[PDB]
Structure 1
Amino acid sequence: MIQPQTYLEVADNTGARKIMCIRVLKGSNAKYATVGDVIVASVKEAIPRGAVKEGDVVKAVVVRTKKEVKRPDGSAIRFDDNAAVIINNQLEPRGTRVFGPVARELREKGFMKIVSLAPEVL
């Protein structure tokens, strides 16, 4: 569901759909890279070419596995942990990416692009 130190997944312009975040970008007292949140990290996994690198950005929270509990008592869980990498502003990293729909995301809102972008099966 969350974590501080983390081996997380992504799938943007990733070096590798994996980076380790330090912590949560929220109210100074992290403890939860939580669903639909924004946080900090560097790469863990490799990267053929790609302008990505073995650095560190911050970004926004996708999937989780341990209760995506929504306002409308909409409920879900994906046996997957990953978010999209950000470039400053938030403005996402890559041109596309491998994943899809569901409230929590769009709801957080700031990232419509991610929104229309990851649609279909997967």
Structure 2
Amino acid sequence: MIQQESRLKVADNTGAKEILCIRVLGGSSRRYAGIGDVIVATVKDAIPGGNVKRGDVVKAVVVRTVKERRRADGSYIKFDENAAVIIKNDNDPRGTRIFGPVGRELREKKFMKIVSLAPEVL
């Protein structure tokens, strides 16, 4: 439920606050991006001395969305506002933490580091 031109909160210690969704990767005319999808985002505003300055183009893995997300037992989970995470070719997050909860689907997605160092997984 993350779309082109959608604002995203940053859930990492890079120095990013607001970013734009470039697209949803891995699909011809793919149209939505929910938690677990590797999507491409651009930095719109960032910390002055942060690790990445605005205008850079980086890939992100969406984690926190205002749209519910299913799970095996029919569980639907709503969050307060969409949140992404910055990542590069090796699929290693460019930050060293995460603020706010996260979703268990990342473990399935094999981004072990994120959920392993997350403050809490739900």
Q: Alpha-carbon deviation of 1:95? A: 1.3
What SS does structure 2 have at the residue aligned with 1:45? Answer: strand
How high is the TM-score relative to the length of structure 1? 0.85
Does residue 1:87 correspond to 2:94, yes or no? no
Does residue 1:21 correspond to 2:21, yes or no? yes
Contact 1:15 1:43 in 2 (8 A): no
In structure 2, what is the equivalent of residue 117 of structure 1? 117
User: Can you give the 5+ residue segments of structure 2 that lack an aligned partner in the other structure?
Assistant: none
| Displacement over 4 Å in runs of 4+ | none
What SS does structure 1 have at the residue aligned with 2:46? Answer: coil
How high is the TM-score relative to the length of structure 2? 0.85
C-alpha distance 28-14 of structure 1, shift in aligned 2 (>3 A): farther
What SS does structure 2 have at the residue aligned with 1:62? Answer: coil
- Aligned counterparts of 1:21 and 1:66: Cα–Cα separation in 2: 16
In structure 2, what is the equivalent of residue 33 of structure 1? 33
Contact 2:63 2:103 in 1 (8 A): no
Percent of pairs identical after alignment? 44
Amino acid at match of 2:90: N
Q: Alpha-carbon deviation of 1:107? A: 2.4
Contact 2:65 2:79 in 1 (8 A): yes
User: Can you give the 5+ residue segments of structure 1 that lack an aligned partner in the other structure?
Assistant: none
Paired positions, count: 120
Contact 1:12 1:95 in 2 (8 A): yes
Contact 2:9 2:84 in 1 (8 A): yes
Query: Alignment RMSD, CA only?
Result: 1.8
Contact 1:35 1:61 in 2 (8 A): yes
